[PDB]
Design a protein around this ligand. Sequence first.
Ligand code: NA
Lengths: 303, 6
Amino acid sequence: PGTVDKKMVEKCWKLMDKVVRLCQNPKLALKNSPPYILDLLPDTYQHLRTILSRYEGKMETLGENEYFRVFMENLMKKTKQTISLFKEGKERMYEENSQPRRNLTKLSLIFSHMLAELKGIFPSGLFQGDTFRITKADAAEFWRKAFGEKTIVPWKSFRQALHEVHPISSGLEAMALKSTIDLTCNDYISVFEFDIFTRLFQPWSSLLRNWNSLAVTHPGYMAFLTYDEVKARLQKFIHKPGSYIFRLSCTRLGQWAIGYVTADGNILQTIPHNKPLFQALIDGFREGFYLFPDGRNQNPDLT
Amino acid sequence: EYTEGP
Ligand code: NA
């Protein structure tokens, strides 16, 4: 992970520009719904402008900062990978269900996760990663004891530390845990990604049992899916009320979004409040709304 | 748009 000089940031901006131009293509018919890459990249630029302006006379400080060096490398990588996607996919980028178009939607989500992370570590343009407040007290002491005040750790280090408190049963389960928590897809775990993961899969005391029941063995769960993709996916079940899927909210990171088909032909999405996801799924089953995960006749039991 | 839980 290299040192960041102003000249590098101007180089990401030129590429981010290149992506915007590609994504302004009328053939894509991109909707405005979150995550919206034509807003996310201008807003990332603007927040990078803000960080830079708070470190006039202190660039040597900013460029040595580890989180920021990793962030900018991943931003170069992701931007370049988006430009390559357009090059290699060509007219398949405009075919609604094509794999290349799906890859663009997942990148759109990753760009959204990167911005939220960048704003959580640099609110107001100054680094505050070493004072980041983890949300679950439980989870908070785990990170302090293992990593002190570090903002970002390599996946391997995170994995080994977690294993000592919450044993991971296998290599394959470890790589599925990775795919879940590593929202920015950069093989590091930030304290912000750790806060998100432990909010979603609380209580910490049964962390990995929760994540196994809700994501690993649950056909309802949908990794890296957007609001629109959830609506389109449930469309094939419009005539099967009680069909439902659930995922991470893009705009409210740390909270769950449940999509379901109603008896009167609506596809609605809801974010549960003052109620863990477990309980909302159990009650939804009892009350008739959440019956058929991904349209399947059989529903996990969560008692 | 997110709506209230059922
Ligand atoms: Na990450």
